[PDB]
Each structure stands twice: as C-alpha cells, then as structure tokens.
A paper describes a structure:
DsbA enzymes retain a conserved tertiary structure, comprising a classical thioredoxin (TRX) domain with an inserted α‐helical domain. The TRX domain contains a pair of redox‐active cysteine residues in a CXXC motif located adjacent to a conserved cis‐proline residue.
On the left‐hand side (distal to the active site), the negatively charged sulfonate group of TC forms a network of polar interactions with the side chain amide of Q160 and a series of water molecules, and its amide NH forms a hydrogen bond with the backbone amide of cis‐P151. Additional polar contacts are made to a symmetry related EcDsbA molecule through the amide carbonyl and hydroxyl groups of TC which point away from the hydrophobic groove, however no hydrophobic interactions are made to the symmetry related EcDsbA molecule and the solution HSQC NMR data are consistent with the binding mode determined by X‐ray crystallography with significant CSP located in the hydrophobic groove. Comparison of the crystal structure of TC bound to EcDsbA with previously reported co‐structures of EcDsbA in complex with diaryl ether 3 shows the steroid core of TC makes similar hydrophobic interactions to diaryl ether 3 in the hydrophobic groove.
Residue numbers in the entry: 5 to 188
The structure:
C-alpha cells in the first residue's frame, strides 16, 4: 500500500485513462520518455483500447513553457504529438534552440505542419479546450512535479517504491503497475 501508487481523494474528471504529466524543459522527463521510453512501454502493456495521453505543464520554462503547453495542445489537436515529442525535447534540451514561441512553431514546420496550419490551430477552439484540459488536470491533482502519471483519474503512480537496480526491471514494474491500475 502506497508502495507503487496512491489513491487520490478527489478523482480527476475527464482525464485520459492513463495521463502522464511532463515538461519539455524537464531533464528527468527527457530521461523518463526518451531513455526509459516509459509511455511506450506502458502502452505496450496497457489493455487494448486504453487511452494514454501526455499533458504538458506550465511550471517550467517560464512563460515559454506555457506557450509549449499550447503548442502541445496544437500537436494533440493535429495528431502529431508522437512525432513532435522528440524534436521538441531535443530543441529544448539538446540543441537549446527553443527560446521563443517562434522556435516552437519552427519545430512544427520542420515536422511538416505548415505555419498557416499551426497558427490556425493555435488560435482554434479545440486547442483552447486542450489547454484548458491540461491546466485543469494539473490543478485537480495540485501537481508540483513532473513527470507524474495518473490512472483512471484516481491513482497516482509512485515510482519511489520500485526497484531501480535494473532499469529494464524498473520500466516493467512501472508498466505492470499502470496496467494493473488501468484494469481497476
Ligand atoms: C523526477 C521524478 C519525480 C518527479 C515528481 O516529484 N513527480 C510528482 C510526484 S510523483 O512522482 O508523481 O509521485 C523522478 C521519479 C522517478 C525518477 C526516475 C527513476 O528513478 C528511474 C531513473 C533513475 C535514474 O537514476 C535517473 C533517471 C530515472 C528515469 C529517474 C529520473 C527522476 O529522478 C524520476 C523521473
């Protein structure tokens, strides 16, 4: 109990069944996703049909981070989030070329989203709604750190209890825990 997850006292309404919070500015999130590939390994183990979604957070990267949350909404709106995840992480943390909102847009353009399509999405209702969802879900759990993962809007993963002597075992322990939780 509490070893691999905790139960929220107030469940999150409208949350993706498997919800990962992250920041492109967060080095740990980069380790979590681009080295451990947690979400990929979780997805492989999830029951068929279960939605896993990543939500961006606003509390890193200054006001640019908030723009990135909106760009991430654009990505989800356009269905390119999986693709742009890598160049956004790399642009922020590796090449350090994401220093303004136009640099974010450039990543999308280079990923094949025309500037005009990005801008129209940026200003669209679907994007505003996705931004509202990301911000509301973070508020609903009083999120103070990333990465974090929540299942069924009810269960918060606790990686602290998990054995880290072997990264492969850690990843599968974590993925197994998510699957178990998703089936509750
Ligand atoms: C920064 C993360 C915790 C952030 C946080 O406080 N989130 C909210 C609370 S909770 O978590 O959701 O409960 C921690 C949790 C698990 C950690 C990871 C795991 O320990 C597995 C490896 C261990 C390696 O030594 C470093 C990379 C890493 C991939 C760790 C990076 C970072 O320290 C993580 C990602």
């Amino acid at each position: 109990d509490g070893k691999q997850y905790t139960t929220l006292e107030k469940p999150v309404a409208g949350a993706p069944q498997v919800l990962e919070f992250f920041s492109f500015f967060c080095p740990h999130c980069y380790q979590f996703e681009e080295v451990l590939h947690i979400s990929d390994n979780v997805k492989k183990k999830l029951p068929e049909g279960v939605k896993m979604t990543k939500y961006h957070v606003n509390f890193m990267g200054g006001d640019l981070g908030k723009d990135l949350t909106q760009a991430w909404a654009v990505a989800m709106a356009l269905g390119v989030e999986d693709k742009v995840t890598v160049p956004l992480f790399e642009g922020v943390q590796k090449t350090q070329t994401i220093r303004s909102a136009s640099d974010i847009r450039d990543v999308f353009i280079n990923a094949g989203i025309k500037g005009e399509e990005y801008d129209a999405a940026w200003n669209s209702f679907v994007v505003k709604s996705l931004v509202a969802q990301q911000e509301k879900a973070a508020a609903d759990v009083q999120l103070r750190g990333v990465p974090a993962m929540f299942v069924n809007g009810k269960y918060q993963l606790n990686p602290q209890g998990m054995d880290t002597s072997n990264m492969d075992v850690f990843v599968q322990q974590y993925a197994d825990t998510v699957k178990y939780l998703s089936e509750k």
